[PDB]
Amino acid sequence: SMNPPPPETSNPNKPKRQTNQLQYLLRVVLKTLWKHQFAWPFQQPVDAVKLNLPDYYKIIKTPMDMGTIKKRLENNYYWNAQECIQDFNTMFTNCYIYNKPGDDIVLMAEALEKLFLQKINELPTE
Ligand SMILES: CCc1cc2c(s1)-[n+]1c(n[nH]c1C)CN=C2c1ccccc1Cl
Numbered sequence: 001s002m003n004p005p006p007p008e009t010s011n012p013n014k015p016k017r018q019t020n021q022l023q024y025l026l027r028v029v030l031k032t033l034w035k036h037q038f039a040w041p042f043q044q045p046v047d048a049v050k051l052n053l054p055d056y057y058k059i060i061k062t063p064m065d066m067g068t069i070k071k072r073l074e075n076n077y078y079w080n081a082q083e084c085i086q087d088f089n090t091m092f093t094n095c096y097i098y099n100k101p102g103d104d105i106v107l108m109a110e111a112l113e114k115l116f117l118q119k120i121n122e123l124p125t126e
Pocket of ligand 1: 040041098104105
């Protein structure tokens, strides 16, 4: 088994901005999820070798994680909040796609997602 390369967090010819909605995604939306007791599986790319989950990346073709999302926010990778919000949703969705209802990991994802939804509710106007 092998892990793929992680998602890129740097791309010089990608257009970037530092919008207030994007400043908010880092300061409220990501920093809220990051500190949570259930954040740890989501803090780095899934290591399918360490976990002995050789199927992971045969199933999940758009991996995403908060380690990547954090690096993207810090390295001003994004153009808009919707690109960043899409990364969060991809992260949650991947978890639900790969894992069975009632798995501990799904309960963890579901806790974080509740907060995530609660924070994006008060995303400022651009
Ligand atoms: C940090 C190490 C990880 C463990 C797990 C990770 S990532 N995971 C998986 N699917 N999506 C994500 C993210 C596979 N299940 C787990 C996992 C999490 C909690 C308890 C047990 C497991 Cl087995």
